[PDB]
Design a protein around this nucleic acid. Structure first.
Ligand SMILES: [Mg+2]
Lengths: 197, 197, 601, 26, 955
DNA sequence: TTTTTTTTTTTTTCTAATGCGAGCACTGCTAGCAGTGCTCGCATTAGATTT
């Protein structure tokens, strides 16, 4: 004797709120900042994965390792940003002389804008890495940006710091994929278990 | 809005003693009174007393014979159906009123207390369930009606004359969910890599 | 622990479940002494007491039972204050240990507020002695002897906050009228905003009518008669108390826009509303209180007017006596000693009752009951007084005789009914006789007495009654709640009759006009053949008949019988056992409060 | 066109019933 | 469930298949049987032996049949104690074994079988049956007559009653009785051309009539009128003669009840509904069933209040009905969301938070009873100030309920043997419920069913422990299995479902709900039942039972047969279909009869014409005039006559000019409350109509994010604290103790963001703030005196701040206060600093212009009290902001600006999907259901006239 | 075991993409200056499905 329910919205939202209580609550305030930036609460979190919850589960391209927790990803990203900040700290003075000596169109790259950008990047680097936010001027100091704008047949300024910034800005830094995968598994499991109950 | 007006009507019938609830139920569009009517009725004591008396009798009918008899007597005495059919657009209004009356009778059969039905109606007004089949709005009239139907619901059907006012309108998909050209498997990319997009 | 023991008290109906739950939650897992103390404090506060002296905690039977668990404590103060649930006010805790007493944190704040308002806040306002004396002499003609009304007027004019105590029919409203007239005539150019409040809507309307009719008689100019207060309100409406929430429209931040305030029937003013009213007053507002100290105490926990007037027995201060002698132009006696000058000077007591003479049996009986002497009460009963009557009610055959006497009591009303008279006369006649019972239900109670009297009117032909109708002509009703639309208040009576247009209930409005209401329009109501002594406050009947049950209940007390006696105008009858009445008069109601200590220290 | 509802010449009867002693006493 | 199903299977085998069980007990298998037998034969054997170990009697009917037959077969004389004679009446189906037993028993005592046989001749395995309507629906009776014929010691006499074919119904009944076929197939061309071969059908004849309706409501409403017409037509007819049979009585019960109850006294028809589910006391049963599920429940506040809804459970803890109105708002405001205590929260493996549980709310209310909230938190819990007086005693009762709810939720968790489950029901009933005169019956029924379940369990000697989820789900199924059919032939017209073996002759036989799929009712076999694999004669199935019930209903009808079904769905105007039975019936009718004047027509045309003549298509609505046109289809309900006649008058315009006289004294609060919303002011103040919408339900879960009025109040508190330069950490701890903020770090993040956003505005306010006091306003404008009070009037000017977005209404309020301040006489400017750098600034104004604008506002108020002032401060404000030019102090005219202003007005009025527009409002919906361009022009004119000075003097 | 009161409203998305305006460096034309090419920043506006 089986019963039929047409709408599973309530069970789905309850399972999502249970997942949120279990995982997002114990987190420390600093990882909590990164989680809160992505989603305000379980209501918003359910909105992203609602389509994927229904029907057969979708194969996820490049899934995170099974043992990777949220704190491990946070520490990894913090370490990467710390490395980039230290490399900027060490080369905070040579970049001016490098840019002035090498040949690049200064119409595209104004000196006042360059000084403002250097100041902002220095202030960000000296700032403690509490969050994953990166300043926009790092996009200006990327190796590809410099290579795009240069004199035809002239010296292009190249520094390992520029290559590091280019490698960093190549892919966004976020905990989104891991949380989405964990939720997509746990909410489905919970819903199935409650419906069996 | 007919649901809210029916709620106000039931709420006044339940306790005609309170002038505020009774006046609120009388001033509904369903009754069809004007502003001069309400003004004169708030001054003359005899008219107010006659209204209180008729509502008290409606309460007795409601206690004895059920729900639908009370609403039927009210419609007959106040000539609600005739005036609604006369007024332009009132046909949909009257159909919704009849539908709400049928739902209220079905729900009052199970609920033994008379107050429980008002509690149930207010509850349903607060959180309407669109997915419910019974709560679906009925057809306005049985006459000829221009049938607006979605493209998905028109599959396998047939129509003499067809209009597509907004066929040109489109949307660009931001999310990265696709199928592999080799494996033919649903792949979700939690990263925003433009290849997937 | 002690939880299992406290679970037993609820079975014996000694401890409320609220008390048990409060003790378990707040006291927690401390020594069972603290849990027991908390339970007893919650119980005493629920029963109406403000505090709990530690001496009381020394051996309630539950305490004797739990002596074994609590063991022996060299100092209860140490054990209590050790726990977190008890403090001295430095940190917010549910219970507070003040001196030798315990308080709920809510009660302690209200107590302190009332204390500081009555001790330090009030000041002495100075005016010309000659001008005030001339005004009072123009108001009060007789200078041969001490007029207590004149002394009360002088007191209320001198001090900012003053209280006037007196029995029913002692001329309170007249004195307040003279006071307000002299006050308006004193300040000519300055704006005087007068406000009138009462804890109940019925008392509010009575105050409106009485003060209006009184002030209209006294000679005043069109300027003064323009400063007469338009209407009197309830305390809640005055403070703008919202129905659902506890938020007040006039909190401490937003004070009342008043010059003088008059609160009638202060006996019903409880401690929380007293504190909330005090919080909303400005620093220039003069307040006058009216009420009888001996009258039945307020419903909620607390007793303010009684605790205040307790110090009035000491008398006036030495210098204040000579001051009032200089003002009233007479000789005012002086109270011996100095205990609290401000409170003693701010209190006046009206000892003369113009309504009933001393030789009348009602006054002597009321005095004997107030004194608590049973022998004096029996002696007053035995004396040849034509206006007091007593009938023994032990067996049902005496109950039937009581019903037969109630027949003759309602005789004129019943005759005017069966004679098809106008509703005005019927209503004026119905207030000539009234039964007053203590309990609500059972053999002696409103619920039972109404049914019995209706069955007795059905047995002997007085009024025809239909079973299905429920609205037989002639039945009196009284309203349960206030209604602003119909303009009728809680505690107002009406008579259901058929004048010919239909069965309608007729009420007497304070303006003398009669108003007819349809039975459907009526709010919650109940048959009023017999009233409780509580709801009878403020009313006055020509012939009152009190009924005390045979059993012993904490409801029957001294103040209850005092109010029931003072209820009648001319004729009073009692139905009670000889022993039960004496036992009730011997026991005085006490509500323990720190005010007694606070005013002395 | 002219519209008119029908009327009932013969009233239906509820005389026939099945009752016990309790119904008769009531 | 598997044990129950196998028990049912074995019972069916006992009744119908004794040879199988006789073989299985020995241990052999039955040849040529189902595949599942392999696991059924041993189990049955293992059962028999099992019941021998316990010592219970060996005898069951399967082995007892042969011994009982052989005893009477060889008995020389009649055994003592047998009754003299037996009657078997109303039973058209018996198992073959019962027939063998009755045949063996007939020797000693006489047995009279009364068999209602629809056909005169031998129609079982006729040596397809002759009649199509009998062959199709007669499977149940063919097997029975074939069994009856095979009896050796049977002496049978036939007592039939011939039917004269004077009607269509009598024609069909005679065709069935005589076992002859009347329908013409039309094989021959000569037979196909002429229609004379069929039988003439009288047009006035209405013995059999089919009716097509839209909804069940319409179906019953048509049936009532048809019954009234049948009663009026025939004086001999009586209500008890009529019967109305439905496929499922519970589906049509409310409609039957409403339609037959709504009839007036002169039109009243008495009715009695039989076979309806027995529901003596629903709420007590439901509350007890919910109490049994205590261990699994999460104890959502709504669920506990649903238990307190029951008057008995509330009386048990002396919680009056008036106290529930308080306990609703108390539960809602205190913060109780889910979980009875911290332990229950940990039991669900969710992180114990310590807030938003019944324990938290109870502690909060108790602390509020002891300590005022102004004091502060005590144990990281803010006291709830509301429950402070004697009413707080309710808490003590509620806290007494939950305590019980705790104890039992720990007691019912563990599994127990059956004998330990016996006192549970009684203890729970007497602990949780205080019985009453009405509820005692339901409580006794509960105890009786529980005792019966456990008694069967103990009689079977079940040793192992049993979980409560088993007994709860058994008792719930057992309690609703009851049916009340005691009013079947009481006297009123009978409404009842089609039940087999109950065939009683009636004069009028009505059938409702014959839609395809609803009737017949289909109950498929278990799937491992061996009977349905190789069936034999006498095996019963629900399909054949319903198909034979339809034939019984036709045969028993003596005068009139009425058939109805839903043709088109009322909701979707789709197409439904009638049952296959109704279809075969109408096919046979149309193939066997012809209307007069259709002799020339061929077979198919006359068949279709007859079928269209008998099938009646009723209207979709009751007030359709087709109902009231003169004819046989005419209705009897005069309530829908004026609607069908279209004689009602349309609703006149709500707006009407009303007399009004401005008093001499108008409080400033009156003007402020009016100008806040001028139409709502006319509704609430002039004619005292208040439209109070129902309060919001308790939220499901604890706060995760803050939005709306919640975060608005929080921001207001925070701003009023920052402007006073007070400590914000105190307010954060206070809100966290109250439980309003989200849990843990998210609460701190939200508080930090709100602190920054409010700190910007607090700095802006502190820049200009100065110590100021309130003042009194006594003013004269247009012979009208205004009396009021203005708070926070600093020497600089009127300073105000609100943590809201920039809106026109706030500007209007500030403008009114500014005009009052200026006309009163003062040197100052008015400022209002709203969220996101919003600013309403007004420079000082002279006394004359101030009085002029104030008189204009008072005149607008008077016009509003006369007729509703169509001034929409938001949409009209957008139009005026678009049209007005601050540089030239004049409004533009060019049509491009007009089109842009119309677009802006429509966007502000309608609103986006995310934010509701100004038009969506209860007060505006009353004045007009849809916005017309004329009303738009009037609104624009009035709003411009009244709001021009605001945008003019705004800087 | 006794009981009094009071009526009103508050909020509203977010991200993204461009158009213009102001400032600046370069550079070509007749050392400075006008044009030009560019770029960042503030305000304004648009859009968010389907059993
Ligand atoms: Mg197809």
């Amino acid at each position: 004797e089986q019963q039929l329910i047409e709408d599973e919205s309530l069970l789905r939202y309850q399972a999502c709120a249970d997942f949120w209580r279990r995982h997002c609550y114990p987190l420390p305030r600093e990882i909590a900042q990164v989680v809160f930036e992505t989603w305000k609460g379980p209501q918003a979190l359910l909105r992203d994965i609602n389509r994927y919850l229904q029907g057969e589960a979708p194969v996820i391209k490049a899934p995170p390792p099974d043992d990777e927790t949220l704190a491990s990803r946070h520490a990894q990203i913090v370490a990467r940003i710390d490395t980039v900040k230290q490399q900027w700290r060490d080369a905070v003075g040579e970049l001016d002389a490098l840019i002035e000596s090498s040949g690049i169109d200064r119409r595209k790259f104004n000196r006042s804008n360059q000084a403002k950008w250097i100041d902002k990047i220095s202030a960000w680097a000296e700032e403690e890495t509490n969050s994953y936010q990166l300043p926009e001027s790092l996009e200006k100091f990327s190796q590809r940006f410099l290579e795009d704008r240069t004199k035809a047949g002239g010296e292009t300024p190249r520094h390992p710091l520029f290559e590091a910034i280019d490698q960093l800005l190549a892919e966004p830094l976020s905990i989104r994929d891991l949380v989405i995968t964990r939720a997509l598994a746990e909410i489905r499991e919970t819903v199935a278990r409650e419906k069996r109950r | 809005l007919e649901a809210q007006e029916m709620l106000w009507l039931l709420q006044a019938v339940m306790t005609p003693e309170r002038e505020n609830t009774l006046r609120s139920a009388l001033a509904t569009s369903m009754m069809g009174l004007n502003a001069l009517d309400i003004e004169t009725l708030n001054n003359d004591e005899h008219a107010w007393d006659v209204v209180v008396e008729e509502f008290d009798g409606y309460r007795q009918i409601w206690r004895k014979r059920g729900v639908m008899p009370m609403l039927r007597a009210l419609m007959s005495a106040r000539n609600i159906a005739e005036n609604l059919l006369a007024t332009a657009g009132g046909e949909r209004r009257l159909t919704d009123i009849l539908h709400i009356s049928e739902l209220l009778q079905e729900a009052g059969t199970q609920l033994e207390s008379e107050h429980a039905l008002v509690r149930w109606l207010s509850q349903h007004i607060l959180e309407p369930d669109s997915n419910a089949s019974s709560q679906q709005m009925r057809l306005e009239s049985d006459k000829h009606l221009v049938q607006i139907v979605t493209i998905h619901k028109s599959k396998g059907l047939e129509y003499p004359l067809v209009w597509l006012p907004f066929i040109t309108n489109f949307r660009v998909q931001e999310q990265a969910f696709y199928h592999d050209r080799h494996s033919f498997e649903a792949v979700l990319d939690l990263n925003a890599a433009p290849e997937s997009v | 622990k002690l939880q299992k023991q406290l679970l037993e008290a609820v079975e014996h109906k000694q401890l409320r479940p609220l008390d048990v739950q409060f003790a378990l939650t707040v006291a927690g897992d401390e020594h069972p002494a603290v849990t027991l103390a908390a339970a007893l404090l919650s119980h005493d506060a629920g029963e109406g007491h403000v505090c709990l002296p530690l001496s009381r905690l020394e051996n309630h039977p539950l305490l004797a039972t739990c002596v074994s668990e609590i063991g022996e404590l060299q100092n209860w103060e140490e054990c209590l204050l050790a726990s977190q649930a008890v403090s001295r006010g430095d940190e917010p805790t549910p219970m507070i240990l003040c001196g030798d007493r315990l308080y709920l944190n809510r009660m302690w704040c209200n107590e302190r507020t009332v204390a500081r308002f009555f001790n330090e806040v009030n000041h002495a306002i100075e005016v010309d002695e000659a001008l005030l004396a001339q005004t009072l002499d123009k108001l009060f003609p007789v200078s041969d002897e001490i007029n207590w009304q004149k002394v009360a007027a002088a007191v209320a004019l001198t001090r900012r906050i003053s209280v006037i105590s007196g029995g029913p029919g002692t001329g309170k409203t007249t004195t307040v009228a003279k006071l307000l007239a002299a006050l308006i005539q004193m300040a000519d150019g300055e704006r005087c905003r007068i406000r009138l409040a009462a804890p109940t809507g019925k008392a509010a309307a009575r105050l409106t009518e009485s003060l209006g009719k009184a002030l209209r008689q006294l000679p005043l100019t069109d300027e003064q008669k323009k400063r007469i207060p338009e209407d009197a309100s309830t305390l809640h409406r005055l403070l703008g108390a919202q129905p659902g929430s506890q938020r007040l429209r006039h909190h401490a931040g937003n004070p009342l826009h008043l010059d003088v305030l008059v609160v009638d029937e202060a006996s019903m003013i409880d401690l929380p509303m007293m504190s909330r009213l005090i919080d909303a007053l400005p620093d220039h507002a003069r307040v006058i209180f009216l009420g009888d100290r001996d009258q039945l105490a307020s419903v909620e926990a607390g007793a303010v007017l009684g605790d205040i007037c307790a110090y009035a027995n000491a008398g006036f201060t030495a210098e204040r006596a000579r001051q009032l002698s200089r003002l009233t132009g007479t000789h005012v006696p002086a109270g011996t000693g100095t205990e609290a000058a401000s409170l003693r000077d701010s209190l006046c007591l009206l000892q003369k009752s113009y309504r009933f003479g001393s030789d009348s049996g009602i006054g002597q009986l009321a005095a004997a009951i107030n004194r608590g002497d049973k022998t004096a009460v029996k002696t007053v009963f035995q004396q040849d007084f034509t206006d007091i009557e007593k009938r023994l009610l032990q067996s049902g055959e005496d109950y039937i005789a009581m019903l037969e006497e109630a027949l003759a009591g309602y005789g004129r009303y019943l005759d005017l009914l069966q004679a098809r008279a106008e509703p005005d006369l019927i209503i004026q006649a119905f207030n000539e006789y009234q039964l007053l019972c203590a309990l609500r239900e059972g053999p002696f109670g409103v619920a039972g007495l109404n049914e019995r009297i209706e069955q007795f009117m059905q047995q002997k032909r007085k009024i025809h009654r239909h079973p299905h109708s429920r609205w037989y002509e002639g039945r009196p009703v009284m309203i349960a709640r206030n209604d602003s639309a119909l303009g009728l208040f809680n505690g107002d009576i009406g008579i259901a009759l058929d004048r010919g247009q239909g069965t309608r209930v007729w009420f007497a409005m304070p303006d003398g006009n009669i108003k007819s209401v349809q039975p459907s329009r009526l709010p919650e109501h109940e048959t009023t053949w017999a009233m409780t002594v509580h709801k009878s406050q403020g009313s006055e009947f020509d012939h009152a008949a009190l009924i005390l049950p045979s059993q012993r209940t904490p409801v029957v007390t001294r103040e209850l019988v005092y109010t029931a006696v003072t209820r009648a105008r001319r004729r009073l009858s009692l139905y009670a056992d000889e022993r039960i009445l004496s036992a009730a008069i011997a026991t005085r109601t006490e509500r323990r409060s720190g005010l007694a200590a606070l005013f002395s220290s | 066109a002219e519209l008119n509802a029908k009327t009932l010449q013969r009233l239906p009867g509820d005389n026939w019933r099945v009752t016990s002693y309790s119904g008769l006493q009531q | 469930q598997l044990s129950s199903k196998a028990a049912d299977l074995f019972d069916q085998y006992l009744v119908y298949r004794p040879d199988w069980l006789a073989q299985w007990e020995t241990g052999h298998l039955v040849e040529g049987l189902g595949e599942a037998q392999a696991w059924q034969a041993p189990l049955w054997k293992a059962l028999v032996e099992y019941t021998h170990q316990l010592g219970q009697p060996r005898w069951h009917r399967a082995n007892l049949y042969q011994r009982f037959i052989e005893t009477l077969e060889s008995a020389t004389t009649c055994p003592p104690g047998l009754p003299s004679r037996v009657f078997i009446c109303g039973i058209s189906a018996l198992p073959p074994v019962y027939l063998q037993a009755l045949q063996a028993l007939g020797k000693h005592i006489e047995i009279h079988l009364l068999f209602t046989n629809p056909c005169r001749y031998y129609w079982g395995d006729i040596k397809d049956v002759g009649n199509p309507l009998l062959a199709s629906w007669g499977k149940l009776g063919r097997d029975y007559i074939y069994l009856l014929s095979d009896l050796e010691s049977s002496q049978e006499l036939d007592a039939f009653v011939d039917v004269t074919p004077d009607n269509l119904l009598h024609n069909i009944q005679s065709d069935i009785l005589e076992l002859e076929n009347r329908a013409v197939a039309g094989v021959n061309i000569e037979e196909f051309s002429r229609s004379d071969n069929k039988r003439p059908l009288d047009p006035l004849d209405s013995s059999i009539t089919f009716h097509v309706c839209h909804s069940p409501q319409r179906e019953v409403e048509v049936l009532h009128d048809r019954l009234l017409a049948m009663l009026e037509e025939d004086p001999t007819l009586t209500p008890r003669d009529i019967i109305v049979m439905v496929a499922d009585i519970d589906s049509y019960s409310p409609f039957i009840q409403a339609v037959f109850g709504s009839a007036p006294a002169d039109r009243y028809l008495p009715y009695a509904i039989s076979d309806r589910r027995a529901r003596q006391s629903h709420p007590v049963l439901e509350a007890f069933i919910s109490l049994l599920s205590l261990p699994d429940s999460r104890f959502v506040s709504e669920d506990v209040l649903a238990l307190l809804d029951v008057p008995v459970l509330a009386a048990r803890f002396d919680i009056t009905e008036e106290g529930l109105r308080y306990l609703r708002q108390w539960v809602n405001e205190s913060g109780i969301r889910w979980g009875i205590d911290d332990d229950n929260v940990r039991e669900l493996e969710l992180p114990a938070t310590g807030q938003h549980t019944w324990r938290f709310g109870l502690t909060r209310m108790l602390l509020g009873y002891a300590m005022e909230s102004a004091q502060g938190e005590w144990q990281s819990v803010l006291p709830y100030d509301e429950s402070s007086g004697l009413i707080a005693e309710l808490v003590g009762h509620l806290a007494s309920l939950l305590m019980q709810l705790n104890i039992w939720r720990r007691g019912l968790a563990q599994e127990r043997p059956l004998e330990e489950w016996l006192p549970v029901c009684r203890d729970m009933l007497n602990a949780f419920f205080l019985p009453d005169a009405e509820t005692e019956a339901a409580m006794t029924l509960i105890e009786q069913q529980w005792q019966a379940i456990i008694a069967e369990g103990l009689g079977a000697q079940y040793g192992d422990a049993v979980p409560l989820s088993l007994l709860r789900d058994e008792l719930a199924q057992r309690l609703d299995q009851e049916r009340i059919s005691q009013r079947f032939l009481a006297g009123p017209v009978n409404i009842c479902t089609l039940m087999p073996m109950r065939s009683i002759p009636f004069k009028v036989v009505c059938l409702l709900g014959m839609n395809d799929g609803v009737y017949p009712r289909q109950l498929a076999p278990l799937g491992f039942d061996l009977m349905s694999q190789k069936p034999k004669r006498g095996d019963r199935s629900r399909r054949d039972d319903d198909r034979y019930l339809f034939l019984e209903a036709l045969i028993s009808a003596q005068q009139k047969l009425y058939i109805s079904y839903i043709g088109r769905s009322i909701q979707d105007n789709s197409e439904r279909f009638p049952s296959v039975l109704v279809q075969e019936l109408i096919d046979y009718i149309g193939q066997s009869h012809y209307l007069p004047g259709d002799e020339a027509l061929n077979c198919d045309e006359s068949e279709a014409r007859v079928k269209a003549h008998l099938t009646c298509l009723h209207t979709r609505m009751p007030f359709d005039p087709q109902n009231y046109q003169p004819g046989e289809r005419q209705s009897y309900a005069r309530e829908w006559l004026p609607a069908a006649s279209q004689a009602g008058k349309a609703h006149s315009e709500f707006v009407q000019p009303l007399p009004f006289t401005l008093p001499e004294t108008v409080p400033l609060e009156t003007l402020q409350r009016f100008w806040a919303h001028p139409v709502r002011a006319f509704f609430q103040m002039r004619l005292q109509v208040n439209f109070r919408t129902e309060d919001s339900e308790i939220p499901d879960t604890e706060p995760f994010i803050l939005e709306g009025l919640s975060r608005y109040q929080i921001n207001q508190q925070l701003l009023n604290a920052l402007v006073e330069q007070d400590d914000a950490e105190r307010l954060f701890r206070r809100f966290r103790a109250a439980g309003d903020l989200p849990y843990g770090a998210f609460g701190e993040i939200f508080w930090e963001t709100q602190c920054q956003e409010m700190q910007q505005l607090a700095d802006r306010v502190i820049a200009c703030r100065q110590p100021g006091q309130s003042m009194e306003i006594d003013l004269a404008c247009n012979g009208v005196q205004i009396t009021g009070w203005l708070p926070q009037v600093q020497p600089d000017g009127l300073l105000r701040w609100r943590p809201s977005l920039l809106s026109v209404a706030q500007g209007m309020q500030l403008w009114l206060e500014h005009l009052v301040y200026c006309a009163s006489g003062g040197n100052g400017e008015s400022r209002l600093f709203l969220r996101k750098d919003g600013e309403w600034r007004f420079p000082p104004l002279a006394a004359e212009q101030a009085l002029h604008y104030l008189s204009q506002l008072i005149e607008g108020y008077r016009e509003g009290m006369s007729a509703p002032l169509l001034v929409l401060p938001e949409s009209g404000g957008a139009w005026l902001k678009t049209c007005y030019d601050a540089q030239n102090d004049a409004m533009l005219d060019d049509d491009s600006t007009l089109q842009k202003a119309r677009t802006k007005f429509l966007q502000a009025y309608e609103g986006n999907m995310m934010v509701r527009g100004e038009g969506d409002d209860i007060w505006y919906q009353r004045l007009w259901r849809q916005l017309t361009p004329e009303t738009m022009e009037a609104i624009v004119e009035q709003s411009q006239r009244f709001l021009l000075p605001l945008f003019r003097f705004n800087q």
